[PDB]
Amino acid sequence: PMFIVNTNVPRASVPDGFLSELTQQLAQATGKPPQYIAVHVVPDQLMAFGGSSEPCALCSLHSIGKIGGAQNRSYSKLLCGLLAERLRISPDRVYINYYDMNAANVGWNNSTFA
Amino acid sequence: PMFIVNTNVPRASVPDGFLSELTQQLAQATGKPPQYIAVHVVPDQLMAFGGSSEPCALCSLHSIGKIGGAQNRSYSKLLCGLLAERLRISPDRVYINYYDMNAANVGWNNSTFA
Amino acid sequence: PMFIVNTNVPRASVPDGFLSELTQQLAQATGKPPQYIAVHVVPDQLMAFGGSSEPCALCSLHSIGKIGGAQNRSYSKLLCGLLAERLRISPDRVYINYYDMNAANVGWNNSTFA
Ligand SMILES: COc1ccc([C@H]2CC(=O)c3c(O)cc(O[C@H]4O[C@@H](CO)[C@@H](O)[C@@H](O)[C@H]4O[C@H]4O[C@@H](C)[C@H](O)[C@@H](O)[C@H]4O)cc3O2)cc1O
Ligand SMILES: [Cl-]
Ligand SMILES: [Cl-]
Ligand SMILES: [Cl-]
Ligand SMILES: [Cl-]
Ligand SMILES: [Cl-]
Ligand SMILES: [Cl-]
Ligand SMILES: [Cl-]
Ligand SMILES: [Cl-]
Ligand SMILES: [Cl-]
Ligand SMILES: [Cl-]
Ligand SMILES: [Cl-]
Ligand SMILES: [Cl-]
Ligand SMILES: [Cl-]
């Protein structure tokens, strides 16, 4: 799976260890081995949410399965909780888009997961 | 909804008020309150369109509904017009990908919209 | 079509000619004219793959058609090969998400391709 967070919070406000915390928390939440979790954090972005440039985040989670109504509610509480605690972003200033990928549409290691 | 524009135009060429203009114009275009609109502009990118690194843009619009044939043509005219007027990017050097998100796949405020 | 590569490799390690090579190889691979191929490379990113910050890449290819099981295996071999040769990223530290876009959902030049 792949998790991306884009935020206007400055880089120095991203704690050391945040990428590893995302990796391990998402490995547990998706049930997949951590070796398959990729995480990407993009701070210092020029962004606005509802017109305001207070701290906000736009995120995505792509996974081959493990995506659905109840699962995404659970991921949203987990991820909003992490963004609030670690980056000080209010949960009502976060959007997370969830993508259930077909294995044939995810390339890796010269091939795909199909 | 969420609108992202990635461009090779330099940061200093992005006018004051650009995020705000996008927020209110996308609010009008989607018919949604400005408080729902998130916008993200990424200047100074290493990008090419047709092999040329003249000014160009790669963009996305994600919305729960309000995405379709005629609607997307109207969004493209609006957004290309803004990129041309404000960033001086030719419309034939802009791509915008449109995504009609299911409410269950959009997380916000510790939950989703399902 | 559009191809985006996000990587933690530093900008100085992206060789001259890289965007052009991507443009030309993707035109050839997809069968589409090079004038319509857009490419975007994002170095210096804060990213991990499997929990490690060794060089890695997260990429996407969006195309109106020319996406499918065998085609995507072929694109992955091509694109991982380029990333290994030019950016010195191991193919097993690359993900590429593939998107078969409907023409109505790709904006360009004040309209869409529908
Ligand atoms: C086609 O179907 C749908 C299409 C679109 C949507 C979306 C899009 C989204 O972006 C969105 C949003 O951003 C905020 C939003 O807010 C309100 O939803 C009501 C109930 O709807 C209340 O419960 C309020 O509490 C109210 O919640 C808040 O108002 C916010 C602006 C504040 O930040 C927050 O603190 C609280 O004051 C509702 C939203 O709806 C949902 C759908 O089902
Ligand atoms: Cl996955
Ligand atoms: Cl970190
Ligand atoms: Cl942890
Ligand atoms: Cl599953
Ligand atoms: Cl579920
Ligand atoms: Cl898919
Ligand atoms: Cl996109
Ligand atoms: Cl919406
Ligand atoms: Cl969706
Ligand atoms: Cl295409
Ligand atoms: Cl992607
Ligand atoms: Cl195929
Ligand atoms: Cl589509």
Round to whole Å and give the CA distance between B15 and A113: 44
| Contact criterion met (CB below 8 Å) for B76 and C112 | yes
**Which phi and psi angles does B93 have, rounded to 5°?**
-120, 25
Round to whole Å and give the CA distance between A99 and A48: 23
Counting one residue from chain B and one from chain C, the pairs whose CB atoms sit within 8 A come to: 100
Burial of B68 (0-12, 13-18, 19+ CB in 10 A): middle
Catalytic residue status for C1: yes
DSSP string, chain A: -EEEEEESS-GGGS-TTHHHHHHHHHHHHH-S-GGG-EEEEE-S-EEEETTB-SS-EEEEEEESS--SHHHHHHHHHHHHHHHHHHH---GGGEEEEEEE--GGGEEETTEE--
Round to whole Å and give the CA distance between C108 and B83: 12
Report strand pairing: C57-63 vs A57-63.
unpaired
Q: How many other CB atoms sit within 10 Å of the CB of residue B55?
A: 20
| Approach to solving | X-ray
Domain of residue C44: give its range: 1-114
Q: C106 has which bridge partners?
A: B97
Burial of B82 (0-12, 13-18, 19+ CB in 10 A): middle
Chain C neighbors (3+ CB pairs < 8 Å): A, B
Q: For residue C104, give the amino acid letter.
A: A
Round to whole Å and give the CA distance between C101 and C109: 17
Give, in degrees to the nearest 5, the angle at Cα B36 between B78 and B82: 20
Q: For residue B65, give the amino acid letter.
A: G
* Helix, strand, or coil (residue C6): strand
Kindly state the helix (H) or strand (E) to which residue B95 belongs, with its residue range.
strand B94-100
Tell me the ligand closest to A104's alpha carbon. Answer: 7
Q: Report the domain count for chain A.
A: 1
Instruction: Write the DSSP symbol of residue C7.
Output: E
Find the catalytic residue in A1, A10, A33, A43: A1
Round to whole Å and give the CA distance between C91 and C84: 7
A21 to chain B nearest CA, in Å? 18
Return the residue whose CA atom lies nearest to atom 13 of ligand 1. B36
A-chain residue closest to C80, CA distance: A110
Distance of CA A21 to the CA centre of its chain: 11
